[PDB]
Design a protein around this ligand. Structure first.
Ligand SMILES: Nc1nc2c(ncn2[C@@H]2O[C@H](COP(=O)(O)OP(=O)(O)OP(=O)(O)O)[C@@H](O)[C@H]2O)c(=O)[nH]1
Ligand SMILES: Nc1nc2c(ncn2[C@@H]2O[C@H](COP(=O)(O)OP(=O)(O)OP(=O)(O)O)[C@@H](O)[C@H]2O)c(=O)[nH]1
Ligand SMILES: [Mg+2]
Ligand SMILES: [Mg+2]
Ligand code: NA
Ligand code: NA
Lengths: 425, 416
């Protein structure tokens, strides 16, 4: 208890440190946007940024080995860069809201038909979420404890018509404000989960009465936990975008891998984007019982995880798992699943600083790195009609002082962020 | 049948001329866009375009002015120009290249082995085919059954490496036997394409597909979609260089997003393609899985849907003929009908469909650019800017009259 009390003490301290770091990194962000507005900055270069990358893609156009670049002039690129500034600011606010929150939101996502719904059902030891051979979950399914809903086991279907976008409709939901959700029982879930054109979020309130609290995930007595079953990747273009959007508003990712396909391209597109903030995530490989070349399949998944996120591969004993339990509490042990359940429980409940706060430090360190790289480039370059020349030389000097100060500030802030130690437990 | 082939050769010559005329229209637009940018719309809006649609996406992330948009659209011109080149090569070729592609682990290689009734191409549960494996009749290689492996280092990129290939030029390929095939197919970082010469003597010519005696056929086993970003890109590019598509669908997933991205792009020219639903024996809800796939076919290509009996097939034939299969026999019969008998539909129609689509887009671009300049800063700038407007208006007047006339030329090519 003394170690658990030191962890809670350390966690609340680091929570305060990262909240201030987000505040000041956002202020460096705000300085960039204000500077880019008055005189455009330099984005071109001939290595790459982590978060502030400006990558232009033509829809329906695939470059096999083409130059890209497109040779857009400076002023047009900076107007597109402003969208990258807004995107990072929204992500920064998503991290700040998560840091202030004390609850841990777990995200179980992956390609279509990998077994995410079956894995969530396994975590609760009850067949609650619909599972099907054909594409099933089309609406985000969030399982919560029944305490918040006064102890009634029912489903709150968040309608999509209450807000212009999905994110705004989810944020609108409050149990005290009816008609922002429709009351449904637990038994219409097969009818609710495919209606992606009607509902944005399914608030599923249940009681984790099955299995005692010492080894139950939702009823741990320590941390409020939220379980979110995600629609499949590689199905719809908008569906993928919505899954991308959720990743920024959840604390923990459990990525479900189909053993035959290994990490697919649609899967790599998610993990690499999540890696902007999430140094560590869970990789659960289902349907491994089918594989007959297990050793070669073994090495192929790990080799891909090593590249997509080497910290997870470094800690593969706790984060890489190969389960076969499919569509509970049977007389059979199933040690593969129990080992994931213990590793998961240990991560969410004992290592708060690692499970909850590490995404903030990783993103801050990466975002500050980019602002350092951007300042360095604009410095070297700004160092390099007649009537219009006098004001162009004056404006160039007015921003070389800006990028000099912004350079100095972010080099300092990066070193300050590294002073935070989240691997205490 | 003697008369029927005379109309085929005439249309092959008629399409060849329209391709050369549209190729020149493309060059003129690219030349004009370089000296003075053109007016284009980014989103769909109304009166949308078929092939020259310009949709912008910032990679990694539920604005832009005239100059910058035209630089973006220039790369779309060269893609259409390169696509027009690949079509011109196809109308030149009297053979039919059949492309068997789809998502990873759908059964692309297994379907090729079934069409040849021979366990030739490697099959594996885990991702296997990474190099384009194309199968020819051994009569083109002096009757020698071997593998010609085209190295990738012989040319800067992959496309030029295949066109470099010549059986008479040595070391532009590497001689390999058929048994080593499991070792060459995963080396996408070393080889660009595998030339596989076999003899289709396992079944008589009346039922064989490669040795039919009527039409030269080439069977191409494709790397799986949704694996690598570059690997998917080369699959996009190979589509433009083949005459027929056999899309292999994974039954439990139906048409994935990566699948829809192939088909929708191939729909720009190919109104008809084959859909083989493999692993259908494992499906529990066969009726609902059938309906799901068919509905997706209807939206992705209605022409294939109205002929679903000839193009949409559900086969349980798998890897793991050392007994005939009725569901699979219906696939080969309909396939043989498409490549051998209905040559004008399977070989010439793609060229015509692209031309009618592209020419329709030039007309709209020319018409819209035309009226838009007709609406309207130092004194030196204005006088030069005015003359450039007059120069671009006169250009699009010529391009409008040229492509409207070429539109009628293409629509009067009667295939049936
Ligand atoms: N052999 C085996 N079958 C599995 C496993 N996990 C799921 N399945 C089966 O594969 C199918 C997929 O079940 P789901 O729970 O719905 O997986 P999903 O990721 O949620 O699929 P979608 O929601 O539609 O995107 C089900 O029929 C399961 O019975 C597994 O670990 N091993
Ligand atoms: N049940 C069933 N299994 C199949 C079927 N076709 C192939 N398989 C099996 O699924 C696996 C796929 O093998 P492949 O022939 O290489 O399929 P593929 O499309 O070429 O996969 P890649 O080349 O790696 O992209 C093999 O182990 C086959 O035995 C089928 O129609 N039904
Ligand atoms: Mg699901
Ligand atoms: Mg294959
Ligand atoms: Na499913
Ligand atoms: Na395979």
């Amino acid at each position: 208890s003394i170690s658990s009390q030191l962890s809670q003490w350390n966690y609340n301290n680091n929570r305060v440190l990262l909240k201030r770091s987000i505040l000041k990194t956002q202020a460096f962000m705000d300085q960039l946007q204000e500077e880019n507005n008055i005189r455009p900055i330099f984005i071109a270069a001939n290595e790459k940024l982590h978060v502030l990358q400006l990558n232009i893609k033509l829809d329906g156009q695939y470059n096999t080995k083409e130059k890209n670049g497109f040779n857009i002039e400076k002023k047009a690129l900076s107007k597109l860069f402003h969208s990258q500034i807004v995107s990072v600011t929204n992500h920064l606010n998503a991290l700040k809201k998560r840091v202030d929150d004390v609850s841990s939101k777990v995200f179980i996502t992956g390609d279509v038909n990998t077994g995410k719904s079956a894995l969530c059902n396994s975590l609760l030891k009850q067949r609650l979420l619909p599972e099907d051979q054909l594409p099933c979950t089309n609406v985000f399914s969030e399982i919560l404890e029944a305490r918040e809903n006064d102890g009634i086991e029912e489903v709150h279907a968040i309608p999509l018509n209450i807000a212009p976008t999905l994110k705004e409709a989810i944020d609108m939901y409050s149990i005290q404000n009816p008609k922002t959700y429709e009351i449904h029982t637990l038994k219409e879930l097969p009818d609710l989960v495919p209606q992606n054109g009607k509902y944005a979020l399914l608030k599923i309130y249940i009681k984790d009465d099955k299995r005692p609290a010492s080894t139950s995930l939702l009823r741990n007595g320590t941390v409020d936990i939220s379980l979110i079953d995600s629609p499949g990747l590689n199905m719809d273009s908008l569906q993928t975008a919505e899954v991308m959007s959720r990743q920024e508003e959840i604390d923990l990712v459990i990525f479900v891998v189909n053993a035959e396909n290994q990490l697919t391209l649609s899967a790599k597109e998610f993990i690499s984007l999540a890696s902007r903030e999430k140094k560590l995530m869970f990789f659960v490989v289902k349907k491994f019982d089918k594989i007959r070349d297990k050793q070669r399949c073994k090495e192929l998944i790990l080799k891909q995880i090593r590249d997509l996120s080497p910290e997870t591969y470094k800690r593969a004993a706790d984060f890489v798992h190969f389960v076969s339990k499919n569509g509970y509490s049977s007389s059979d042990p199933d040690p593969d699943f129990d080992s994931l359940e213990d590793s998961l429980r240990n991560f969410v409940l004992k290592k708060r600083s690692l499970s909850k706060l590490l995404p903030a430090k990783t993103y801050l360190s990466k975002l500050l790195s980019d602002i350092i790289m951007i300042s360095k480039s604009n410095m070297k370059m700004y160092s390099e009609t007649k009537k219009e020349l006098e004001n162009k030389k004056e404006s160039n000097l007015l921003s070389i002082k800006f990028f000099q100060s912004l350079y100095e500030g972010t080099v300092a802030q990066k070193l300050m962020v590294e002073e935070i130690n989240l691997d205490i437990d």
